[PDB]
Design a protein around this nucleic acid. Structure first.
Ligand SMILES: CN(C)C[C@H](O)CN1CCN(c2cc(C(F)(F)F)cc(C(F)(F)F)c2OC(=O)N(C)c2ccc(F)cc2)C1=O
Ligand SMILES: Nc1nc2c(ncn2[C@H]2CC[C@@H](COP(=O)(O)OP(=O)(O)OP(=O)(O)O)O2)c(=O)[nH]1
Ligand SMILES: [Mg+2]
Length: 634
DNA sequence: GCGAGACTCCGCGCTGCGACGTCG
DNA sequence: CGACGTCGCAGCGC
């Protein structure tokens, strides 16, 4: 009763006994064995109980030649795909990557109900460290840790069998993993039921992982010439900014040096020094009204960020898609977050700057709009669809607090953020530009989620006591919100956690800390996690339900990764392809024929993802790029 | 294995560059 | 003195 690896493809009789038993199993685990040569799948291990790992070789030599590779590929797809009336669950460590490797390297599209123990670990504690196979075995199967004691890829985030960079055979890594993750996932399912989170796991979180796998196979379209065009414009503005700045300072300085900037502004120019000599964005936002140089430093930092942190990473990661005839970006989704919202890495498409303006040329300069999102384009002939939850966290705060004033501002009032800048600056709400509106937006959510008066004063260019009047006024105006905050802190001090709309718990032991810094931090986390975490739940429910509806149409492809395998073994592009998620907004790449059908499916499924005491307002915008979106009435 | 400090008081998140160190 | 290295910040996003 140790690791028994059964090489099922070594004897044709043993293989048909294996296929027979496999087709009876309602639950099993698989672990892809991948080696270098490379995304070479040399086989997979299946486990449906105990310490038996049935290794299905997809390569060798000791295999029965009567089992051709194409024969073995037929049985592999037959056992990994459903008949749509039989419920069958597959346990897969790192399901997203395995799903993509199976499709792209083996031509097999998984068609069952999936369970990733990594996702289960996050669901039970969202602040836990990102799980590794070692951590899951250390936690749940500590007796089995010797099996991995030799394995050193175990403490990595990547699946054991998927880690081709290992001196161990893929057969042994996959076999070990299949047994460990099968029994671990059984423990994790008992914990999910104990916490009443298994329906969230099976109906929301795992299907959410399925949608992100389609997104990662799709990628997002990217125009290299559009991005290169903006870099030249920006770099010319940067050269002019540096020239004008050095004339104002009377000498050359380093924009990247906080000391040179502090010396010029305060030591030389004698600008109000404000514990001081700080070159922060808050300090320069106030000083830019007195002298032009602070504003030039802010513009220099904005453009340098766009060039060094956006332009070059995007052109670094662009890949050619020969089937669509375009370049695309393929980011990696990340769902192990504190509040359950999805982010992206390599590169982080969510960080693409909003549109900004640069004046160039003589005589005050003519305006030019830098829209880096305009570089993200659909496939030739398609459109980008952008449906957005209007004021999601504010409507969730209204549903949970029943604050009649907030509900009134949402249903009838004008834009809150523009009205905040108006009362702040004593100006018209229409005169508020996007930069000022963004300042008022952070002021809004900052005050709501517990910002102090010292920081609010540094953000508003006023002193701490005048900012305290703004905070005190908000509490006076919005007592329903303030009582929801008092009640949330109280219930978190009693329970040790807070809950989202779906029941997910975030544990905040600092709520009972005596140090006032740690206590207040947990108190603000408690209020924010409930709202932001519930917003993340709703967007996930909508993403899953939209994908379920798009696949009811036979013309639809699951992803570009699927269709480009069906072109390799006469497919006009159809349907909408999930390309990006923006915390309260979903982007889709849709064919022109189905631009209206997908737009109606997206809006209706978003507006009815959950039922709240406040309606979920959704606005759909379609355009020829992420940056050139126009309203679409749907 | 404990929990200094006076350091830390909107929340969530990713990453290229700069500041200070190191090998040679 | 230079190349290469490492960790955290401060820039941007929601
Ligand atoms: C609808 N009526 C006609 C009322 C009319 O709009 C009056 N205003 C204007 C803004 N505003 C408001 C609204 C909300 C939200 F709707 F989201 F609940 C939140 C804040 C918050 F959080 F920023 F304080 C708000 O700002 C404030 O209340 N103050 C005191 C404030 C103003 C400016 C500033 F720079 C800092 C604070 C509000 O009620
Ligand atoms: N705590 C906090 N949450 C923020 C902040 N900025 C954004 N968020 C969260 C709450 C709202 C959510 C989405 O914000 P967006 O800016 O995309 O949307 P919005 O705030 O409703 O404005 P708009 O409709 O103009 O996009 O992200 C911030 O500064 N602090
Ligand atoms: Mg929004």
């Amino acid at each position: 009763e140790s690791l028994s690896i059964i090489d099922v493809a070594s004897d044709q009789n043993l293989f048909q006994t294996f296929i027979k038993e496999w087709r009876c199993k309602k639950r099993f685990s698989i672990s892809l064995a991948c080696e270098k040569i490379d995304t070479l799948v040399v086989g997979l291990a299946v486990c449906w109980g105990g310490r038996d790992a049935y290794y299905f070789s997809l390569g060798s030599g000791g295999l029965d030649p009567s089992l051709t590779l194409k024969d073995r590929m037929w049985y592999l797809q037959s056992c990994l795909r459903k008949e749509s009336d039989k419920e069958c669950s597959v346990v897969i460590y790192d399901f997203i990557q395995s799903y993509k490797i199976l499709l792209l390297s083996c031509g097999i599209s998984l068609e069952q109900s999936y369970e990733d123990p990594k996702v289960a670990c996050w669901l039970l504690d969202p602040d836990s460290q990102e799980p590794t196979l070692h951590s899951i075995v250390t936690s749940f199967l500590p007796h089995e840790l010797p099996l991995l004691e030799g394995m050193e890829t175990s403490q990595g985030i990547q699946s054991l069998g998927l880690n081709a960079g290992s001196e161990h055979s893929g057969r042994y890594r996959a076999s070990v993993e299949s047994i460990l993750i099968f029994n671990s996932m059984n423990q994790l399912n008992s914990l999910l039921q104990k916490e009443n989170l298994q329906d969230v796991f099976r109906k929301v979180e795992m299907p959410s992982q399925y949608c992100l796998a389609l997104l990662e196979l799709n990628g997002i379209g990217f125009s290299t010439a559009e991005c290169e065009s903006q870099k030249h414009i920006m770099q010319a503005k940067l050269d002019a900014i540096e020239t004008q700045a050095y004339q104002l300072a009377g000498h050359s300085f380093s924009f990247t040096s906080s000391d040179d900037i502090a010396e010029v502004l305060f030591l030389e120019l004698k600008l109000p020094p404000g514990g001081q000599f700080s070159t922060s964005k808050d300090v320069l936002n106030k000083l830019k009204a007195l002298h032009p140089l602070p504003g030039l430093i802010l513009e220099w930092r904005r453009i340098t960020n766009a060039i060094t942190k956006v332009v070059f990473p995007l052109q670094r990661e662009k890949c050619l898609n020969p089937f669509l005839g375009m370049e695309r970006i393929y980011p990696v989704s990340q769902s192990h977050t504190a509040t359950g919202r999805i982010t992206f890495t390599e590169p982080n498409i969510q960080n693409v700057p909003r549109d900004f303006e640069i004046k160039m040329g003589g005589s005050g300069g003519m305006p030019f709009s830098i829209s880096m999102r305009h570089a993200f384009v659909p496939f030739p002939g398609g459109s980008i669809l952008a449906a957005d939850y209007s004021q999601l966290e504010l409507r969730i705060l209204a549903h949970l607090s029943h604050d009649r004033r907030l509900i009134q501002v949402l249903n009838t009032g004008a834009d809150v953020f523009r009205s905040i800048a108006a009362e702040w600056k004593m100006i018209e709400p229409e005169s508020v530009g996007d930069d000022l509106r963004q300042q008022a937006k952070q002021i809004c959510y900052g005050i709501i989620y517990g910002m102090g008066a010292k920081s609010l004063g540094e953000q508003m260019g006023i002193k701490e006591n005048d900012a305290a009047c703004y905070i005190d006024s908000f509490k006076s105006r919005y007592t329903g919100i303030n009582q929801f905050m008092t009640e949330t802190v109280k219930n978190c001090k009693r329970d040790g956690f807070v809950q989202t709309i779906l029941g997910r718990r975030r544990y905040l032991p600092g709520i009972k800390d005596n140090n006032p810094y740690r206590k207040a931090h947990a108190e603000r986390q408690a209020i924010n996690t409930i709202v932001q975490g519930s917003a993340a739940d709703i967007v996930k429910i909508a993403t899953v339900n939209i994908q379920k509806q798009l696949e009811t149409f036979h013309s639809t492809f699951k992803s570009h990764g699927h269709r480009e395998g069906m072109l390799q073994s006469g497919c006009p592009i159809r349907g909408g392809f999930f390309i990006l998620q923006l915390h309260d907004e979903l982007l889709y790449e849709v064919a022109e024929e189905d631009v209206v059908q997908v737009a109606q499916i997206v809006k209706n499924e978003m507006e009815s993802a959950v039922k709240l005491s406040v309606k979920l307002k959704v606005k759909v915008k379609i355009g020829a790029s992420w940056g050139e979106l126009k309203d679409f009435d749907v």
